[PDB]
Structures are given as C-alpha cells and as structure tokens.
Amino acid sequence: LTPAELIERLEQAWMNEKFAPELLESKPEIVECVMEQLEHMEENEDLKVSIHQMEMERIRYVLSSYLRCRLMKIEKFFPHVLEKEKTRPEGEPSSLSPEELAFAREFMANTESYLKNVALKHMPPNLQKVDLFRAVPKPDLDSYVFLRVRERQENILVEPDTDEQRDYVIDLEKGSQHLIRYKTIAPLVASGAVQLI
Amino acid sequence: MFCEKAMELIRELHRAPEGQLPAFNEDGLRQVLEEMKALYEQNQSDVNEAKSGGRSDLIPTIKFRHCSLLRNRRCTVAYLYDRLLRIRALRWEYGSVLPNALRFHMAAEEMEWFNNYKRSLATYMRSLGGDEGLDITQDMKPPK
Amino acid sequence: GPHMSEAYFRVESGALGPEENFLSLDDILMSHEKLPVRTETAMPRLGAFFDNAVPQGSKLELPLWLAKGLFDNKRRILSVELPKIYQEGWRTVFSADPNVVDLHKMGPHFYGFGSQLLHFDSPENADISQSLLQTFIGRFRRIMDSSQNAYNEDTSALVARLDEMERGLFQTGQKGLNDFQCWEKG
Amino acid sequence: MDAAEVEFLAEKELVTIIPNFSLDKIYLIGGDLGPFNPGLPVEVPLWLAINLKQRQKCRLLPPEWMDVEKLEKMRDHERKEETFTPMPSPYYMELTKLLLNHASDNIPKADEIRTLVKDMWDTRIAKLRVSADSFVRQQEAHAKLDNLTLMEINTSGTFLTQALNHMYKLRTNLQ
C-alpha cells in the first residue's frame, strides 16, 4: 500500500465516519501507518521544508478529526459500543481499537460510579439500578445519508415505510450519487463499494 | 402534584444555552430524593393495607405513586447526565485546567468525574503514536 | 465558549418515533404537558391534588407521563381524551394550509406530543398520524426557504410560529447556509 | 462537516502555476511535484499554489473552464435542465473563491467570473429547494443527484437529512 493510497484511505474513513450514524470499523493499519509517516517526516532547502511541513499539517488535521469523530461516537453510545464488541464473533472485524475499547470501558465505569454515588444509592431500595444500555439511545441506523458510488452494486433495498409491499430495489452505478437511509447500504460503506459524503 | 420539583431541574438546564453549566442544584436534588423516599414509604404501607385488609381499591393510588417514582428518577438521571455532557465539553473548550468560575458551578462528584475523564482521555491520546501519541484536542480546524 | 456547541453532545429527542428518549430533556418537557382524562375508578388519598379519595369519572388534566403510566387498553384506571388540537376539526383546518397555524402556541411540541398520543390506541390513530406527517410536509418548504434566506425575508415572525422540532430544523438550515456564506467572505 | 473542510478537499485539485524560482522534484506523500523552473508551467495542488502565490513565488493560471463565454453557456444549459448538469469542476465554487481571493489579478475579467459563478450557484440551489420539496411531497425514500458538487450537497445536506429523518419517524410511528 503506497503512502499516497494510505492518505486516500484515511480521508475515505474520515468522511464515512463523519456521516455514518454508528461507529464504523477500526482501521489500525491506517492510523498506525499514518502516525509513522508523520513521525518520519518529523525527522527534519527551507522552501522544501516548508512545503513538506504544510503537507504534514494537512494529514495531521485529517487524522485528528477522524479520531475525534470516533471518540464522539464512543462517548455518545458507550453502552452499545461495548455490548456490540463483547458479542462480536471471533474473526469478525472489530469497531474498537484496543485503546478505544479501554477508553470506552473507563467512560462507562466513571459514569455509572458518578450516577450511583450522587443519586442512585440514595433512591428507594428497588429503584437504585439503571440499565444504561436501555437509558442511552442506540445509533439510529435509519438516518439518511448522501453517498458516492465507487464500485457498482445491484439490488439495493429501498423501504419507504413499514409496509413491505412498497419495497423496491435500485442499482448503484459507479460514479453516481444518492440520498438514502443508511441502514440498507451499511455493508457497502464497510467494504468501500460506496463513499458517504 | 408530585414531580414538580424534578421539572425545575430539567427546565433550569434546558434554558442554559451553548452547554453553559448553571450551579449544581443541590437543594432541588435533595428535595426530589426526599419526595421519592416519602412516595416509597406511603406505597409500602398502602401495599400492606392491600395485603392485610383486602384494599385492592388502593392499587390505582399505588401505581400512581409508582409512576411518580419512576418519573422522579428519570428526571434526576437525565439532569445529572446532561450536566456530565456539558462538563465533558469543558475539557475540550477550556483544556485540562478549568477556570475557577466554571468549577464553582460544579458538584464535588462532578469534578471527580471530570478528572477521571481527563485522565482517560490523556491516556488514550498518549497511546496513539510513539512519542506522547497525538493531542487530538488540537488541530480543531483545517490548515489555513 | 461559542464553539463549545460541538463538544456538547446533548441527548436528542425520540418522541417522533415509538418511544421517547429516556435521557432527552426535550422529551421530558414534552411529556410534562397536560392531557384530558377521566378516571374509571376512585383513587384513595389523592383528592388533595385535585379516604380523601378522588371520585371516579372525574374530569382531570394529567401530564402525559402519568396518563401513560395509568393507561391500558381497557378503561381500568383511566380513559384518555384527545386534545382538541388533534381532533378532526383542527386537522381539517391544518389541511387547508399547514403554514397558517402557530405550532408554538399550539405546541410547543406539536409533533412530539401528537406522536406519543398514539399510545392510547385511539380509533383515530391513523388520522392523527397522517395529519402530523402531512402538516410537516406542508410547512417544509417555507422552513427551508426561510432558514436559507432564499427571499431575504425577516425570519423572526416565522420562528415564533415554529414548534420545537421545526425550530431545530430551522436552526440547522440556517447554520449550514450561514457557514457557507462566512466561508465565502474571509 | 463545515465548508472549510470541503475547501480542504478542494485544495487537492491540481492547478497550473508559473514559478519564478528553481526547485528540485519534491517527493511528497501523495505525489511527486515539479521540478520547478522559472517561467515554466507546472501542475501543483491548489493549496501549494495558493501558498507559493502568497510567497510571491509564482503566478496562477486560470483553469480553462473559468472563462466568461463558457460560464454563460453552462449557466444557460443549467436552466434548461430539470436535473443538475455536470459542472466544470467538482469544486467549482472553491476554485473560483480561492482563485479570485488570492489571484484575481491573474484571472481575466475576474468580476464577471465572480458574478457568473454566483448565478450558477443561485440557479442550482433554487433548483435544489424545488427538487427537495417535490421529493418530500411525494414521500420518496431515495433520490439520485449525480451532478451536485460536495459544497452544494453539504450546505443543504444536514438540513435535508434531518428533515427526512423526522419524516421517516412520522411515517412509521404507528406500525
């Protein structure tokens, strides 16, 4: 994977994460390799130095934004992000890096402890327990999103409402742009077939 | 009747714009917890009169107090939770050290939650790369 | 801090769907709004708020959360009444021109409250539901035009007539347009 | 996503400059640039072009599509179409903005270009509101918008998705 391709995949993940209503798959290969590239370029005529530094800043910003985006999602849906990872089948791609997982567990422990000490333990006997998995909203997979097709895919399911007889299918042509519920095309975001914008 | 005090907590917060953190309402919190205590006690005796007096005619009043208990609890948790969401924003907007005027409106337990969050975040960011990882609380805007 | 709006993740509302969000401050304010109800049984030791009991068949205005709690398909404890604003008269009037109605005065959570009103399995549920949807569809354009300042009209008069959810949507349209214009300047 | 971030992406587009300095082929992550030679044309990322420009180390050349006559026809073509027509660039608003703000003295009839580009934008966003209104009135659950650019999509984007999200919930709150 070329350094150029690396930055390209970084920006793709950055955009997908921005618009997807749920936390997407962890991309260790990208974060780590980009971090290295940034450190290797830290090992530093002047015009050439300025230009290199300028590109570094561009890459830095994208990585930082992407990472902040993922932390925001982790914090908003911490109980669901943890439950999904706990039940993930061995072998399936994870949506949490080791560090994000630790961070999420800590956010959970910190919040439960706070709620327990400040109010929960002071409530009637059978009202002291609050299931945060049920109290905290889950990611709304029905959210609408715009996308760009980078790899052709036929038979995308469109479900206007609750009545299945209204369902129909469409084809996603390379280079086309669409507006649709995220839920139906979710697996295409994961594989790279489409790009959220 | 019941749960009016709990609503004061909610309104006070909802009126505070841009994540502003108003003073922790200790009295409101106390009074709600006290209302829940009373409600629980009255229901305990009534559920007893309905167990030793054939007062199944008290069930309506019983569920009534029960709904009020769940409501008081919902408001309490929502209030406290939202405040934590604003306190969390403080770390990103003002940094590791909070202005004392901002700390003044926080409860002792909230400062503790803040410090634990501060530490977890620092640890996370420190793990990103080789040397001191990466401070993602910086570079909030794209290069000029 | 003005830009602290991005680091503050308030729990959003869920009242437009099946259930409201437990931690949503807005849904909590919404479910506090009163609803017309008639008791189907006496409630001992409670008349003080309205054995010092509350007579059956009493006409009461109870907050939505309590009404929900004491309700069940059967008229066991309560029988719920639809607010006039969601009855045939008003929905026919809404049908003539959705934009003419002040949803702040008749709200402020018109869509949210009306959506949660469906939990009382009223015979008119289908009509209530269709009405909420068509009302939104009919005021959508006015909201997009104004929030994006398409005609250079003062938006103050429109904002005052928007329900809480519409105000949020309006704010988003304004934010997106404003952001672009400022980027356009400096 | 903010307009600034959309511009960030636009800044990756290649533009042609006339350097007034000498420089060896630089090896940047994402593409080698140059070599750079005085008075000779070379393609570089828009962000570099803008920086060098500010350093008074080059002059920017107007993209071929950034021409009055051409822009007038595109604008006219846009009006006759019900859907959105292919734009000269995926970032025409950004290239016009940045080029006129940092190299207007290098763009012929800059004022006329600014006016035409603005009218192109005004024409398209009006068409967007119209299209969105009919999309909503027919309660559609999907639409194709092949020629809308990122800046145009993003400016109305959050508004449109939130509105549709509210509608989807209103259309499914019974079943």
XYZ file of C-alpha atoms in Angstrom:
702
model
C 0.000 0.000 0.000
C 1.535 3.251 -1.283
C 1.840 6.215 1.118
C -0.445 8.067 -1.285
C -3.025 5.280 -1.123
C -2.683 5.380 2.655
C -3.696 9.040 2.835
C -6.506 8.295 0.401
C -7.955 5.556 2.619
C -7.534 7.847 5.627
C -9.656 10.544 4.014
C -12.244 7.957 2.969
C -12.611 6.720 6.547
C -12.674 10.343 7.756
C -15.672 11.126 5.530
C -17.505 7.844 6.175
C -17.148 8.298 9.937
C -18.445 11.856 9.698
C -21.747 10.779 8.196
C -22.400 7.209 9.383
C -24.874 7.152 12.319
C -22.917 4.342 14.038
C -19.233 3.825 14.878
C -17.538 2.224 11.864
C -14.825 -0.447 11.758
C -11.485 0.221 13.417
C -8.682 0.940 10.931
C -5.414 0.123 12.796
C -3.399 -0.305 9.594
C -4.269 3.276 8.646
C -3.869 5.122 11.945
C -0.572 3.388 12.749
C 0.989 3.809 9.293
C -0.107 7.438 9.059
C 1.306 8.075 12.528
C 4.617 6.602 11.397
C 4.658 8.686 8.217
C 4.100 11.759 10.386
C 6.921 10.790 12.736
C 9.312 10.008 9.876
C 8.620 13.431 8.397
C 9.273 14.830 11.869
C 12.909 13.836 11.393
C 13.655 17.252 9.897
C 16.124 23.712 1.302
C 13.847 25.767 3.556
C 11.198 26.074 0.853
C 11.271 22.282 0.562
C 10.981 22.071 4.350
C 8.004 24.434 4.482
C 6.175 22.547 1.742
C 6.734 19.207 3.494
C 5.586 20.678 6.790
C 2.463 22.042 5.096
C 1.509 18.607 3.804
C 2.173 17.156 7.262
C -0.312 19.602 8.767
C -2.943 18.599 6.193
C -2.527 14.925 7.121
C -2.373 15.700 10.846
C -5.685 17.531 10.726
C -7.472 14.676 8.949
C -6.170 12.076 11.377
C -7.072 14.214 14.381
C -10.545 14.950 13.049
C -11.195 11.279 12.283
C -10.053 10.220 15.750
C -12.137 12.920 17.452
C -15.161 11.834 15.429
C -14.769 8.221 16.598
C -14.366 9.302 20.257
C -17.515 11.396 19.979
C -19.404 8.301 18.812
C -17.831 6.156 21.508
C -18.970 8.588 24.172
C -22.486 9.081 22.814
C -23.204 5.358 22.502
C -20.805 3.832 25.049
C -23.121 1.053 26.305
C -23.936 -0.072 22.766
C -20.375 0.170 21.511
C -19.273 -2.073 24.395
C -22.143 -4.570 24.063
C -21.505 -4.984 20.332
C -17.796 -5.661 20.859
C -18.492 -8.136 23.673
C -20.750 -10.194 21.416
C -18.615 -9.829 18.296
C -17.931 -13.314 16.837
C -14.239 -14.209 16.954
C -12.981 -13.445 13.464
C -15.327 -10.555 12.607
C -13.797 -7.053 12.121
C -13.897 -5.019 15.339
C -15.277 -1.483 15.665
C -12.942 -0.600 18.543
C -9.161 -0.448 18.678
C -7.673 -1.739 21.947
C -7.178 1.794 23.281
C -10.681 2.942 22.258
C -12.076 -0.150 23.993
C -10.219 0.729 27.205
C -11.365 4.370 26.912
C -14.990 3.268 26.443
C -14.867 0.916 29.440
C -13.454 3.758 31.528
C -16.129 6.213 30.356
C -18.697 3.605 31.408
C -17.195 2.899 34.853
C -16.744 6.626 35.509
C -20.363 7.472 34.601
C -22.007 4.587 36.493
C -19.960 5.332 39.591
C -20.890 9.014 39.410
C -24.596 8.294 38.971
C -24.569 5.710 41.756
C -22.810 7.915 44.320
C -24.586 11.173 43.604
C -28.142 9.868 43.311
C -28.850 6.190 42.625
C -27.730 4.855 46.011
C -29.993 7.437 47.646
C -33.168 6.231 45.956
C -35.696 3.677 47.252
C -34.463 0.040 47.551
C -35.795 -1.223 44.206
C -35.042 1.917 42.161
C -31.264 2.134 42.621
C -30.370 0.354 39.400
C -30.481 1.986 35.974
C -29.560 -0.057 32.916
C -27.502 2.377 30.847
C -27.895 0.082 27.843
C -31.583 0.985 27.875
C -31.209 4.575 29.110
C -28.725 5.680 26.438
C -30.111 5.919 22.853
C -28.757 3.466 20.283
C -27.290 4.646 16.970
C -30.213 5.416 14.609
C -29.404 3.301 11.560
C -32.377 4.751 9.688
C -30.645 8.151 9.426
C -30.435 9.487 5.886
C -27.072 9.995 4.195
C -25.696 11.104 0.829
C -23.211 8.837 -0.940
C -20.968 8.427 -3.962
C -20.626 5.037 -5.656
C -17.059 3.839 -6.247
C -17.923 0.202 -7.004
C -21.052 -0.929 -8.844
C -23.668 -2.860 -6.875
C -27.101 -4.022 -7.943
C -30.269 -4.612 -5.908
C -30.043 -2.120 -3.072
C -33.181 -2.355 -0.958
C -35.356 0.717 -0.500
C -38.051 0.523 2.205
C -40.092 3.755 2.187
C -42.200 2.865 5.233
C -43.498 -0.031 7.364
C -45.373 -1.750 4.519
C -43.027 -4.245 2.829
C -45.156 -4.342 -0.333
C -43.853 -0.838 -1.066
C -40.253 -2.068 -1.061
C -38.274 -1.999 -4.287
C -34.686 -2.215 -5.488
C -32.274 0.077 -7.297
C -28.845 -0.319 -8.824
C -25.879 1.769 -7.705
C -23.818 2.748 -10.734
C -20.138 3.638 -10.496
C -19.750 7.387 -10.058
C -23.402 8.028 -9.189
C -24.638 9.983 -6.142
C -27.560 9.043 -3.911
C -29.660 10.088 -0.911
C -30.933 7.140 1.114
C -31.418 5.579 4.544
C -28.053 4.384 5.839
C -29.338 1.050 7.141
C -29.787 -0.534 3.726
C -26.346 0.341 2.354
C -24.375 -0.122 5.586
C -22.366 -3.164 4.369
C -21.314 -1.192 1.273
C -19.757 1.526 3.424
C -17.771 -1.156 5.252
C -16.413 -2.717 2.021
C -15.699 0.536 0.213
C -18.312 -0.002 -2.505
C -19.775 3.413 -1.622
C -18.459 6.577 -0.004
C -20.570 8.708 2.334
C -20.429 12.465 1.616
C -48.655 17.366 42.389
C -45.629 15.075 42.504
C -42.589 15.525 40.255
C -42.964 19.319 40.005
C -39.640 19.866 41.751
C -37.947 17.438 39.378
C -39.200 19.535 36.449
C -37.455 22.594 37.865
C -34.147 20.769 37.469
C -34.904 19.987 33.823
C -36.106 23.493 32.907
C -33.110 25.194 34.522
C -30.781 23.105 32.369
C -32.778 23.384 29.171
C -32.733 27.187 29.468
C -28.930 27.259 29.681
C -27.678 27.891 26.112
C -24.452 26.688 24.469
C -23.746 23.996 27.053
C -23.413 26.594 29.815
C -23.233 24.967 33.217
C -25.549 26.528 35.797
C -24.933 25.979 39.512
C -25.445 22.394 40.643
C -28.945 22.380 42.142
C -28.207 20.614 45.444
C -31.464 21.632 47.105
C -33.552 20.517 44.141
C -31.764 17.172 44.061
C -32.242 16.724 47.798
C -35.945 17.594 47.672
C -36.571 15.153 44.819
C -34.749 12.347 46.584
C -36.837 13.175 49.670
C -40.053 13.068 47.641
C -39.102 9.636 46.328
C -38.448 8.476 49.890
C -41.868 9.673 51.058
C -43.590 8.200 47.989
C -41.888 4.856 48.617
C -42.933 4.839 52.280
C -46.570 5.682 51.557
C -46.694 2.953 48.934
C -45.143 0.425 51.321
C -47.940 0.882 53.853
C -50.681 1.011 51.212
C -49.370 -2.140 49.541
C -49.595 -3.587 53.038
C -53.201 -2.495 53.577
C -53.870 -4.162 50.228
C -52.195 -7.296 51.587
C -53.810 -7.268 55.034
C -57.193 -5.605 54.675
C -58.466 -6.505 51.226
C -57.807 -2.989 49.964
C -57.326 -3.806 46.281
C -59.069 -0.449 45.842
C -55.712 1.126 46.689
C -53.923 -0.312 43.660
C -54.810 2.723 41.500
C -53.203 5.008 44.072
C -50.319 2.559 44.334
C -49.498 2.589 40.613
C -49.964 6.352 40.749
C -47.148 6.733 43.277
C -45.107 4.174 41.387
C -45.285 6.156 38.130
C -44.271 9.253 40.075
C -41.253 7.403 41.476
C -40.068 6.363 38.014
C -40.651 9.905 36.750
C -38.654 11.496 39.583
C -35.855 9.045 38.842
C -35.936 9.713 35.096
C -35.655 13.483 35.637
C -32.865 13.029 38.164
C -30.741 10.859 35.902
C -31.421 12.999 32.811
C -30.438 16.149 34.733
C -27.226 14.659 36.135
C -26.325 13.023 32.818
C -26.805 16.133 30.729
C -24.591 18.065 33.148
C -21.840 15.487 32.589
C -22.174 16.053 28.833
C -21.574 19.804 29.367
C -18.706 19.167 31.786
C -17.151 16.885 29.187
C -17.343 19.741 26.685
C -15.432 21.909 29.173
C -12.343 19.745 28.772
C -12.326 20.303 25.021
C -13.191 24.001 25.159
C -11.077 25.177 28.116
C -8.423 22.483 28.481
C -7.035 20.458 31.383
C -7.294 23.300 33.890
C -10.768 24.711 34.391
C -11.360 28.384 35.207
C -12.426 28.609 38.857
C -15.641 30.399 37.915
C -16.540 27.293 35.907
C -15.534 24.919 38.707
C -17.697 26.923 41.122
C -20.888 25.650 39.456
C -19.800 22.014 39.660
C -20.502 19.499 42.409
C -17.567 17.761 44.122
C -18.591 14.499 42.467
C -18.677 16.252 39.085
C -15.088 17.437 39.481
C -14.148 13.834 40.218
C -15.928 12.613 37.095
C -14.091 15.369 35.200
C -10.661 14.339 36.479
C -11.293 10.689 35.653
C -12.418 11.708 32.162
C -9.361 13.959 31.879
C -7.084 11.021 32.741
C -8.734 8.503 30.427
C -8.515 10.994 27.565
C -4.861 11.770 28.270
C -4.094 8.058 28.377
C -5.937 7.423 25.118
C -4.173 10.250 23.252
C -0.812 9.162 24.645
C -1.313 5.690 23.120
C -1.900 6.877 19.549
C 1.680 7.130 18.316
C 5.227 6.667 19.544
C 6.169 9.786 21.495
C 3.285 11.272 23.507
C 0.930 9.966 20.828
C -1.170 12.808 19.433
C -3.143 15.616 21.087
C -6.382 15.460 19.119
C -7.801 18.292 21.235
C -5.539 20.407 18.992
C -5.903 20.953 15.237
C -9.651 21.514 15.535
C -9.719 23.380 12.220
C -8.204 22.531 8.830
C -4.885 24.221 7.811
C -5.279 27.861 6.730
C -17.366 29.406 24.659
C -19.370 29.791 21.410
C -17.806 26.801 19.634
C -18.441 24.590 22.655
C -21.636 23.562 20.877
C -19.687 20.846 19.065
C -18.163 19.191 22.130
C -21.547 19.111 23.913
C -23.500 16.010 22.793
C -26.984 16.579 24.216
C -29.242 13.531 24.060
C -31.652 14.160 21.185
C -35.417 13.679 21.158
C -37.081 10.390 20.272
C -40.748 11.381 20.675
C -41.398 11.327 16.915
C -40.986 7.566 16.952
C -42.344 4.613 19.048
C -40.918 5.768 22.398
C -39.362 8.963 23.699
C -35.695 9.024 24.719
C -35.240 8.400 28.431
C -32.465 11.000 28.827
C -33.880 13.578 26.407
C -34.525 16.822 28.271
C -36.868 17.915 25.500
C -38.983 14.747 25.707
C -39.186 15.167 29.474
C -40.512 18.714 28.993
C -42.883 17.424 26.325
C -44.351 14.597 28.445
C -44.983 17.116 31.222
C -47.683 18.827 29.159
C -51.238 18.112 30.348
C -53.800 15.780 28.801
C -57.613 15.495 29.327
C -58.550 12.314 31.175
C -61.497 10.776 33.037
C -60.951 8.361 35.919
C -62.653 4.974 35.643
C -62.149 4.191 39.330
C -61.748 6.103 42.574
C -58.230 6.891 43.746
C -57.977 6.916 47.576
C -55.874 9.560 49.310
C -55.203 11.703 46.226
C -58.060 14.198 46.096
C -55.709 16.669 47.773
C -54.011 17.182 44.405
C -57.302 17.849 42.619
C -60.032 8.159 52.229
C -59.769 11.723 50.901
C -60.009 9.878 47.581
C -60.607 11.129 44.047
C -64.143 10.355 42.790
C -64.438 8.079 39.770
C -65.494 9.626 36.471
C -63.692 12.818 37.466
C -62.507 15.057 34.628
C -58.783 15.633 35.068
C -55.866 17.173 33.216
C -52.866 14.945 33.820
C -49.326 15.234 32.466
C -48.671 12.867 29.568
C -46.215 10.724 31.547
C -48.706 9.978 34.336
C -51.550 9.397 31.860
C -49.304 6.921 30.015
C -48.456 5.110 33.243
C -52.041 4.648 34.438
C -53.341 3.699 30.984
C -54.047 0.269 29.488
C -56.180 -0.873 26.532
C -59.039 -1.367 28.996
C -60.638 1.502 30.924
C -59.243 0.013 34.137
C -57.902 3.213 35.685
C -58.221 5.933 33.034
C -59.935 6.763 29.759
C -57.918 9.215 27.653
C -59.294 12.120 25.649
C -57.642 13.645 22.565
C -56.734 17.336 22.900
C -58.906 19.466 20.588
C -55.788 20.320 18.552
C -55.507 16.731 17.336
C -59.213 16.208 16.573
C -60.946 16.290 13.176
C -61.753 19.989 13.316
C -58.172 21.192 13.693
C -56.649 18.625 11.357
C -59.049 19.674 8.604
C -58.025 23.301 9.214
C -54.353 22.248 9.136
C -55.160 20.527 5.855
C -56.234 23.822 4.246
C -52.845 25.435 4.868
C -50.304 23.932 7.335
C -48.288 27.171 7.240
C -51.091 29.295 8.691
C -51.018 27.563 12.084
C -48.862 28.765 15.003
C -47.311 25.491 16.186
C -45.510 27.224 19.033
C -48.799 28.326 20.617
C -50.493 25.017 19.832
C -47.279 23.187 20.689
C -44.505 23.786 21.535
C -44.001 20.047 20.922
C -46.807 19.559 18.412
C -45.254 16.633 16.558
C -43.677 15.009 19.598
C -46.761 15.168 21.819
C -49.057 14.107 18.968
C -46.784 11.180 18.198
C -46.876 9.946 21.803
C -50.639 10.494 21.901
C -50.867 7.408 19.657
C -50.107 5.192 22.672
C -53.723 5.396 23.827
C -54.834 3.240 20.881
C -57.447 5.782 19.806
C -59.703 4.827 16.862
C -58.417 7.987 15.167
C -54.736 6.983 15.452
C -54.387 6.548 11.695
C -55.891 10.001 11.099
C -53.762 11.637 13.795
C -50.617 10.030 12.331
C -51.395 11.009 8.746
C -52.198 14.545 9.893
C -48.876 15.032 11.733
C -46.989 13.870 8.634
C -48.913 15.985 6.119
C -48.615 19.035 8.357
C -44.823 18.693 8.390
C -44.651 18.097 4.647
C -46.748 21.199 4.084
C -44.538 23.529 6.130
C -41.236 22.015 4.997
C -40.675 24.369 2.034
C -41.448 27.521 3.993
C -38.907 26.345 6.553
C -36.201 25.575 4.017
C -36.727 28.838 2.127
C -36.590 30.939 5.297
C -33.764 29.123 7.040
C -31.716 29.515 3.844
C -32.779 33.145 3.348
C -33.916 32.475 -0.229
C -36.079 35.598 -0.406
C -34.333 37.941 2.031
C -37.348 37.856 4.336
C -37.116 38.536 8.057
C -37.418 35.131 9.732
C -38.439 36.429 13.159
C -42.183 36.107 12.502
C -41.785 32.550 11.175
C -39.561 31.288 14.014
C -42.124 32.439 16.557
C -44.703 30.129 14.935
C -42.469 27.045 14.708
C -42.755 24.109 17.108
C -39.620 22.947 18.961
C -38.699 20.330 16.384
C -39.220 22.786 13.497
C -37.080 25.382 15.282
C -34.292 22.819 15.495
C -34.613 22.023 11.806
C -34.717 25.743 11.004
C -31.566 26.301 13.063
C -29.784 23.558 11.089
C -30.713 25.087 7.741
C -29.581 28.488 8.951
C -26.321 27.068 10.307
C -25.474 25.339 7.046
C -26.281 28.395 4.944
C -24.506 30.790 7.321
C -21.410 28.581 7.451
C -21.195 28.659 3.656
C -21.649 32.441 3.430
C -18.963 33.162 6.001
C -16.606 30.763 4.236
C -17.474 32.830 1.172
C -16.306 36.055 2.840
C -12.959 35.860 4.607
C -18.956 18.867 8.054
C -18.067 22.557 7.518
C -17.459 24.490 4.307
C -13.837 24.891 5.394
C -13.435 21.104 5.350
C -14.979 20.906 1.887
C -12.466 23.517 0.780
C -9.771 21.326 2.348
C -10.665 18.643 -0.176
C -10.945 21.161 -2.993
C -7.377 22.234 -2.235
C -6.193 18.855 -3.549
C -7.268 19.706 -7.097
C -4.397 20.364 -9.497
C -3.827 23.890 -10.787
C -1.104 25.215 -13.119
C 1.387 27.826 -11.913
C 4.307 29.847 -13.245
C 7.102 29.705 -10.664
C 9.802 32.378 -10.555
C 12.223 30.113 -8.687
C 14.190 26.898 -9.186
C 13.476 23.733 -7.219
C 14.199 20.018 -7.460
C 11.429 17.450 -7.793
C 9.939 17.271 -4.299
C 8.752 13.906 -3.032
C 5.546 14.448 -1.092
C 3.257 11.816 0.387
C 0.590 11.574 -2.289
C 2.577 12.564 -5.359
C 5.877 13.946 -6.607
C 5.796 17.560 -7.744
C 7.994 19.533 -10.107
C 10.835 20.012 -10.838
C 10.159 23.756 -10.678
C 11.675 26.145 -13.227
C 11.228 29.927 -13.722
C 8.648 30.882 -16.336
C 7.703 27.252 -16.936
C 4.206 25.737 -16.341
C 3.856 23.073 -13.641
C 0.838 21.404 -12.014
C 0.630 21.522 -8.226
C -2.042 21.045 -5.533
C -4.221 24.128 -5.126
C -3.042 24.555 -1.529
C 0.593 24.789 -2.624
C -0.285 27.158 -5.473
C -2.039 29.477 -3.033
C 0.841 29.398 -0.569
C 3.569 29.987 -3.166
C 1.382 32.759 -4.584
C 1.342 34.455 -1.183
C 5.111 33.992 -1.043
C 5.257 35.895 -4.341
C 6.960 32.884 -5.891
C 4.522 32.186 -8.707
C 1.558 33.390 -10.736
C -1.578 31.265 -11.011
C -3.078 30.375 -14.374
C -6.903 30.374 -14.704
C -8.464 26.961 -15.274
C -9.642 26.669 -18.890
C -13.291 26.490 -17.787
C -13.021 29.723 -15.802
C -13.970 31.790 -18.851
C -16.860 34.246 -19.259
C -18.265 32.889 -22.538
C -18.006 29.284 -21.346
C -19.611 30.098 -17.993
C -22.516 31.878 -19.675
C -23.312 28.775 -21.716
C -23.053 26.448 -18.713
C -25.410 28.679 -16.747
C -27.826 28.756 -19.697
C -27.612 24.975 -20.070
C -28.350 24.555 -16.347
C -31.626 26.487 -16.675
C -32.942 24.296 -19.493
C -32.403 21.102 -17.491
C -34.759 19.714 -14.848
C -31.911 17.894 -13.093
C -28.402 19.112 -12.295
C -25.895 19.369 -15.132
C -22.192 18.374 -14.974
C -20.159 21.240 -13.542
C -16.739 22.311 -14.936
C -15.149 21.085 -11.694
C -16.211 19.016 -8.653
C -15.141 22.086 -6.690
C -16.081 24.995 -8.973
C -17.247 27.172 -6.072
C -13.984 26.599 -4.196
C -11.623 27.100 -7.148
C -13.473 30.284 -8.073
C -13.424 31.548 -4.477
C -9.751 30.788 -3.818
C -8.510 31.927 -7.232
C -10.347 35.251 -7.100
C -9.392 35.848 -3.460
C -5.672 35.190 -3.985
C -5.039 35.636 -7.712
C -7.833 37.766 -9.165
C -5.071 39.822 -10.784
C -4.288 36.622 -12.702
C -7.892 35.885 -13.687
C -9.233 37.717 -16.776
C -12.449 39.671 -16.129
C -12.480 38.402 -12.538
C -15.601 40.403 -11.649
C -17.617 38.869 -14.473
C -16.427 35.392 -13.462
C -17.467 36.067 -9.857
C -20.961 37.104 -10.994
C -21.475 34.154 -13.337
C -20.285 31.595 -10.775
C -22.579 33.108 -8.147
C -25.533 32.937 -10.534
C -24.630 29.318 -11.290
C -24.778 28.637 -7.555
C -28.024 30.605 -7.098
C -29.623 28.814 -10.018
C -28.663 25.400 -8.653
C -29.661 25.899 -5.018
C -33.067 27.185 -6.114
C -33.361 24.049 -8.230
C -32.274 22.081 -5.137
C -35.054 23.530 -2.971
C -37.587 22.783 -5.677
C -36.325 19.233 -6.074
C -36.236 18.669 -2.309
C -39.796 19.982 -1.969
C -41.147 17.531 -4.564
C -39.055 14.728 -3.041
C -40.739 15.456 0.300
C -44.271 15.940 -1.070
C -44.140 12.568 -2.878
C -42.711 10.983 0.282
C -39.873 9.353 -1.658
C -37.288 7.247 0.191
C -34.445 7.634 -2.295
C -33.101 10.035 -4.895
C -30.183 10.186 -7.292
C -28.279 13.500 -7.594
C -25.380 12.743 -9.932
C -24.057 16.219 -10.705
C -24.388 18.086 -7.445
C -20.991 19.030 -6.007
C -19.841 18.404 -2.437
C -20.116 22.077 -1.455
C -23.718 22.205 -2.709
C -24.653 18.897 -1.096
C -23.018 19.777 2.205
C -24.529 23.250 2.544
C -28.114 21.894 2.471
C -27.074 18.380 3.459
C -27.589 18.326 7.201
C -30.886 20.141 6.763
C -32.220 17.645 4.233
C -31.180 14.517 6.108
C -32.579 15.781 9.408
C -35.889 16.693 7.727
C -36.130 13.286 6.059
C -35.205 11.587 9.326
C -38.085 13.356 11.083
C -40.430 12.395 8.279
C -39.364 8.751 8.312
C -40.264 8.625 12.005
C -43.595 10.343 11.410
C -44.304 7.879 8.600
C -43.519 4.897 10.835
C -44.788 5.865 14.303
C -47.881 3.605 14.128
C -46.767 0.190 12.854
